[PDB]
């Protein structure tokens, strides 16, 4: 009875965090769509940046004062989301604790498309 194995918590923890990042990314990808839809000339995208995308997203459950307190946090192998403002790309990263290979999501609105 003493020999029964005990599983580690971190294995279930990390694989849930991997779901959180993957949800928030898919919300930001339509928030930014609304911003480009509503900039004063929507036909010519201009200098999107995360701090100015803020008013489309609700406060955290503590009613704190900025979305860096709401969007998720990661090692980024610290904000789990970043904008490459001059290159017009959004990137979201999940880094495992165990040394497994990292997962990076991406979105890209500057006329690149699939080109294939």
Look at the block and give the residue holding tokens 């930001």.
Answer: 28
* 46, 39 Cβ separation under 8 angstroms: yes
Interaction of residue 1 with a copy of itself, rule CB under 8 A:
yes
Interface of this chain with a copy of itself, residues 32 to 51, rule: CB under 8 A: 33-34, 36-38, 40, 42-43, 51
Run of H or E residues at 36: helix 10-38
78 contributes a contact to a copy of itself by CB under 8 A? no
**Torsion angle defined by CA atoms of residues 55, 61, 65 and 67, in that order, rounded to the nearest 10 degrees:** -50
Q: Is 85 in the site for a copy of itself (CB under 8 A)?
A: no
Which of 19, 84, 85, 102 touches a copy of itself (CB under 8 A)? 19
């Amino acid at each position: 009875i003493a020999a029964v194995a005990i599983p580690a918590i971190t294995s279930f923890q990390d694989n849930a965090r991997k779901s959180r990042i993957q949800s928030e990314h898919r919300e930001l990808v339509s928030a930014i769509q609304s911003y480009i839809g509503a900039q004063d000339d929507p036909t010519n995208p201009s200098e999107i940046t995360l701090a100015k995308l803020a008013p489309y997203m609700s406060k955290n459950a503590k009613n704190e004062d900025g979305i860096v307190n709401s969007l998720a946090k990661d090692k980024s192998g610290g904000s789990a989301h970043q904008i490459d403002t001059t290159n017009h790309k959004l990137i979201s990263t999940f880094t495992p604790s165990n040394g497994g290979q990292a997962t990076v999501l991406t979105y890209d609105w500057s006329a690149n498309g699939v080109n294939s």
